[PDB]
């Protein structure tokens, strides 16, 4: 698919993603904090449609992600991210998508998620996260 | 004077400042790199005029600041930054301003300057720098 | 179990762990690098015996861990780390233990594991990792 790399910022304000309970995660877009002001990251969209939109608005800066988890698996012969769950110090958002396949989870004891990168074709093929103090 | 804080970024692409060789540094503005794209920082302007403009365009990312030096001292009753010199891995820009007073210098063996904060009234009162790997 | 926290160092030179093919991971000790000098971490031992020892000697500093993975599961009513696998830029060490339960994995694109903390009773109850550039 089409690779993307948002880079690192100073925090996360909002996350917008879409999914399909029969396939995987589709679109992914984040509104970051850039030194106290909102910064709208590019919208990384799937090549197809039919996904259910989801908006995660965090109460920045008191609320922040403490754990990201989800599932990866095969869909149409491709290994992709099928589900995502975001747990903050105030609430748990998700799971969004199909909770089937191989789970993964990244609990953060000290530090913050400040950026995302990955690739999206029909679905989110893979993603990585920038971490900072 | 009026305080300012640009915050932290990915790197430095251009520095635009003004100075008066017989007094001190006036205006200060930085064009930062924000994950591969230029980010125009706010122009921090002196309350008075009569300054000589200077544009420092760096060959980002192969060229970067390795040392910042200058002088502080009185201009009338105010202690301000009278002069600044920027030394990169490729050239030396400056000195700009009064090269007399109390010297200061910050050589960097490992790391990068990724942001500026300070205060400007008639002249640059003081400034600090954000450092990162 | 008994909690431990090695803290953070400059890198990793060797990992000494023990495991049992039918239960989980037992003893855990790391020889870190401390500014170019080997630093022997405290040996965190299981309260019981019968484990098979393994010594992972890395070709420091050219060889480093790029991914840590494993499984967590129930053993005698306790949720513990049942298996561990260490993948470096040169080889794959493991899996050691039993690959049954819930998998987890931590791939690193940029950065290094520089320390460990956790808890060990009969087996490795849990563990966390210090990351740094």
């Amino acid at each position: 698919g089409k690779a993307f790399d948002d880079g690192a910022f100073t925090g996360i304000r909002e996350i917008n993603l879409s999914y399909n309970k029969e396939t995987a995660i589709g679109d992914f877009q984040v509104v970051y904090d850039l030194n106290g002001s909102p910064y709208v990251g590019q919208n990384h969209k799937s090549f197809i449609t039919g996904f259910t939109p989801v908006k995660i608005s965090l109460d920045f800066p008191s609320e922040y992600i403490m754990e990201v988890s989800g599932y990866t698996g095969n869909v149409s012969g491709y290994v992709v991210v099928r589900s995502l769950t975001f747990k903050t110090n105030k609430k748990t958002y998700g799971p969004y998508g199909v909770t089937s396949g191989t789970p993964f989870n990244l609990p953060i004891e000290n530090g913050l998620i400040v950026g995302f990168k990955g690739s999206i074709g029909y679905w989110l093929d893979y993603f990585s996260m920038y971490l900072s103090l | 004077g009026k305080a300012f804080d640009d915050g932290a970024f990915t790197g430095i692409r251009e520095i635009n400042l003004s100075y008066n060789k017989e007094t001190a540094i006036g205006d200060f503005q930085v064009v930062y790199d924000l994950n591969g794209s230029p980010y125009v920082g706010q122009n921090h302007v002196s309350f008075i005029t009569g300054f000589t403009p200077v544009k420092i365009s760096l060959d980002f990312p192969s060229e970067y600041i390795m040392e910042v030096s200058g002088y502080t001292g009185n201009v009338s009753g105010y202690v301000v930054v009278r002069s600044l010199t920027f030394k990169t891995n490729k050239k030396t820009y400056g000195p700009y301003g009064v090269t007399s007073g109390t010297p200061f210098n910050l050589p960097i063996e490992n790391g990068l300057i990724v942001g500026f904060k300070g205060s400007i009234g008639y002249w640059l009162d003081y400034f600090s720098m954000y450092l990162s790997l | 179990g008994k909690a431990f926290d090695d803290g953070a160092f400059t890198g990793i030179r060797e990992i000494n762990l023990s495991y049992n093919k039918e239960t989980a991971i037992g003893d855990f000790q790391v020889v870190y690098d401390l500014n170019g000098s080997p630093y022997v971490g405290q040996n965190h031992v299981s309260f019981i015996t019968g484990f098979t020892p393994v010594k992972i000697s890395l070709d420091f500093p050219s060889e480093y861990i790029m991914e840590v993975s494993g499984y967590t599961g129930n053993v005698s009513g306790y949720v513990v780390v049942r298996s561990l696998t260490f993948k470096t830029n040169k080889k794959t060490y493991g899996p050691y233990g039993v690959t049954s339960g819930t998998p987890f994995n931590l791939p690193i694109e940029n950065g290094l594991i520089v320390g460990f903390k956790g808890s060990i009773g009969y087996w490795l109850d849990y563990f966390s990792m210090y990351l740094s550039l």
């Binding site: 690192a8 989800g70 990866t72 491709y78 290994v79 992709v80 991210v81 993964f104 990244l106 400040v114 950026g115 990168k117 990955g118 690739s119 989110l124 093929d125 893979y126 993603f127 990585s128 996260m129 920038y130 971490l131 900072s132 | 970024f9 990915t10 790197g11 430095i12 790199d33 760096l58 980002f60 990312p61 192969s62 060229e63 970067y64 490992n110 990068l112 990724v114 990162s132 790997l133 | 790029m66 994995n105 931590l106 791939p107 690193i108 694109e109 940029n110 950065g111 990351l131 740094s132 550039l133």
Partner: peptide, 18 residues
């Protein structure tokens, strides 16, 4: 080094590209 700041990056999860 280069003039680009760096930060720790964990992943990727999903398709193995590394």
């Amino acid at each position: 080094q280069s003039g680009i700041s760096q930060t720790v990056i964990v992943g990727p999860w999903g398709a193995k590209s590394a």
